[PDB]
TrEMBL record:
It comes from Triticum aestivum. This is Polyadenylate-binding protein. It is found in: Cytoplasm; Nucleus. It comes from the Eukaryota. Belongs to the polyadenylate-binding protein type-1 family. Binds the poly(A) tail of mRNA. Residues 6-83 form the PABC domain.
Length: 85
């Protein structure tokens, strides 16, 4: 069954930790990869989606085109005003 370590390797579900737990965890390794810009706004778009949407976490911390999607929306709320009056 297990190849390396007992846990995780034995069960795939074991590795499938909560989105928030993985969030920073994957972004920790992949965010630096995905992390397009400086953690300032970069950490928000790339690493935040890591728990927001399953499709986004997978897409954002793996694909570049994924960044354009969240960055435009996310960077709008941070870099730009929040909603309209």
């Amino acid at each position: 069954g297990p190849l390396g370590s007992p846990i995780g390797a034995l069960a795939s579900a074991l590795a499938n930790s909560p989105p928030e737990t993985q969030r920073m965890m994957l972004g920790e390794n992949l965010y630096p990869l995905v992390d397009q810009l400086e953690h300032d706004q970069a950490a928000k778009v790339t690493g935040m989606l890591l728990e927001m949407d399953q499709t986004e976490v997978l897409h954002l911390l793996e694909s570049p085109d994924a960044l354009k999607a969240k960055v435009a929306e996310a960077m709008e709320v941070l870099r730009s005003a929040q909603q309209h009056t």
